């Protein structure tokens, strides 16, 4: 009790968290208080809830732990975007607009931690199916949002780009994944009146694989620089070719092209891909084909180990 914690108190998590105390606190006679703190740099590894170590402090300071009741926020960094900004330019080319499918896509992309989005307007309203994904209502806009943003912020953005009298259709069972099932996020209208409802969906997770046959020709050796190129292309760091997005489809020819632009002179022979659901084991060599349809709803992901390269 009655101990004042000085500013810039060090606090290291077990995998070298290196968190800093930003504001000073005073311990009340109860013996347990609450402090706020920040990560030292751009990146902070996820702190497992343990008793945080005390490095720099006063004389009395005993210990400090972490509980799930504590709050969090997820960083996003690394130009951010450097050369995929050229890709994002064509997507968010209508940020300054509102009340349109393109403006909706642009704004919901401008939300942080939104890797990709898909928007369907289904404007010839007769229920039916338009451009994939069935629609219960005649006129309704369906939004598939990848990434892991905050529901509140993305809901605010979706309401900001509202279009007026278009509902949000996200049903058809398997079509997407409902974010909160029926009766989605309420959000509040900035023009004060009622708590509305905005419905968007999350794409179905898919796990992809790649089998490559290369010759290692031209006297240029590269044992495991292939999967790095494949994963870079999948994540979208290449210029002009967006990676595995909601509307994307895992294509052997695209994987081959990315591999070649990263390193030429290997004479790629086979680039079978195939893909499975979020779980499931490896799809066996029988499944490895040249393409996957990869319907509009759904996002594929290529792990670092899911690419296997063979020298011939």
């Amino acid at each position: 009790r009655s101990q004042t914690r000085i500013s810039t108190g060090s606090r290291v998590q077990t995998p070298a968290g290196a968190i800093f105390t930003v504001l000073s606190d005073v311990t009340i006679p109860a013996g347990g208080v609450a402090t706020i703190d920040i990560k030292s740099q751009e990146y902070g590894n996820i702190p497992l809830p343990v008793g945080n170590l005390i490095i720099i402090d006063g004389t009395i300071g005993w210990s400090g732990a972490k509980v799930i009741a504590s709050t969090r926020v997820d960083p996003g960094s690394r130009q951010m975007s450097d050369a995929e900004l050229k890709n994002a330019r064509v997507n968010r080319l209508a940020i300054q607009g509102r009340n349109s499918t393109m403006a909706i896509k642009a704004y919901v992309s401008a939300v942080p931690n939104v890797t990709s989005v898909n928007v369907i307007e289904n404007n010839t309203g007769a229920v039916q199916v338009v451009n994939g994904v069935s629609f219960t209502l005649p006129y309704a806009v369906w939004v598939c949002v990848a990434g892991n943003p905050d529901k509140q912020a993305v809901a605010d953005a979706l309401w900001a780009a509202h279009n007026g009298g278009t509902p949000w259709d996200y049903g058809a069972t398997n079509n997407g994944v409902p974010v909160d099932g029926p009766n989605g996020v309420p959000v509040r209208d900035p023009a004060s009146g009622r708590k509305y409802v905005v419905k968007w969906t999350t794409p179905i997770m898919y796990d992809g694989y790649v089998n490559v046959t290369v010759q290692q020709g031209s006297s240029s050796v590269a044992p495991e620089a292939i999967q790095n190129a494949v994963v870079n292309y999948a994540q979208g760091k290449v210029e002009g070719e967006e990676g595995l997005v909601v509307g994307a489809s895992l294509s052997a020819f695209e994987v081959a092209g990315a591999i070649a632009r990263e390193i030429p002179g290997i004479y790629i022979k086979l680039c079978q891909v195939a893909c499975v659901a979020a779980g499931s084991p490896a799809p066996a060599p029988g499944d490895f084909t040249s393409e996957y349809v990869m319907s509009a709803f759904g996002q594929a992901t290529i792990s670092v180990g899911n690419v296997r390269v063979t020298f011939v």
């Binding site: 810039t8 060090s10 490095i55 720099i56």
Partner: protein, 214 residues
């Protein structure tokens, strides 16, 4: 780490020099054991008192390898403890380099000129609060385990040699001289004197019923 009105007066400069020269005088700090082996009695040691720079950041000191650990023995009757990693104590410092003395245990020159540095010295273990004393051993020399269960409690008059499991003695020729108070069986040479018996001639091969009874 300097003051502006220094560099103005000579004894300002001189007491700054004295402070620095006394700061470099490594004498004694608490420390911890990183590595240890009982056969060679040398332990890698991490000091437990940080450095401090002007920014008020603490830089951990350096591991001091191959520091002898005291044993407190004379005539070969030494006392040993299972020094293990993570145990704390205090490290001392030598007047000169004892590196040449360590491997020989004889009169030898200081190998280098390093004076009063922590990096040659000893490590005396110490548990501080980390031990529990039973109330029955208040005023008594009590040597126990970590929490205290195998305490030898030498009192002013009596002795209490506690042990949860066994007080095995490997001596072959006990010469204890006094009344015992064993409150259980004896199993002397696997015969169980408590439930023992006898056989006589009338009756012949007569299992004398019961055990020992007055």
């Amino acid at each position: 780490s300097a003051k502006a009105p220094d560099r103005t007066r000579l004894i300002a400069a001189l007491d700054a020099r004295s402070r620095r020269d006394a700061l470099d005088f490594e004498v004694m700090i608490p420390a911890q054991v990183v590595q240890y082996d009982r056969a060679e009695n040398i332990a890698t040691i991490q000091p437990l008192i940080t450095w401090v720079d002007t920014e008020h950041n603490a830089v951990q000191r350096h591991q001091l390898v191959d520091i002898p650990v005291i044993s407190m023995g004379a005539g070969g009757f030494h006392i040993s403890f299972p020094i293990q990693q993570g145990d704390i104590g205090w490290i001392y410092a030598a007047d000169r380099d004892t590196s040449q003395f360590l491997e020989s245990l004889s009169m030898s020159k200081p190998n280098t000129g390093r004076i009063h540095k922590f990096e040659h010295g000893l490590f005396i273990p110490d548990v501080f609060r980390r031990y529990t004393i039973n109330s029955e051993d208040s005023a008594a020399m009590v040597i126990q385990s970590t929490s205290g269960a195998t305490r030898i409690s030498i009192r002013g008059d009596n002795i209490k040699i506690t042990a949860p499991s066994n007080v095995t003695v490997d001596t072959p020729q006990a010469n204890f001289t006094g009344n015992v108070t064993i409150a259980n069986t004896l199993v002397v040479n696997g015969i169980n004197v408590n439930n023992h018996g006898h056989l006589e001639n009338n009756p012949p091969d007569a299992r004398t019923k019961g055990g020992m009874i007055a």
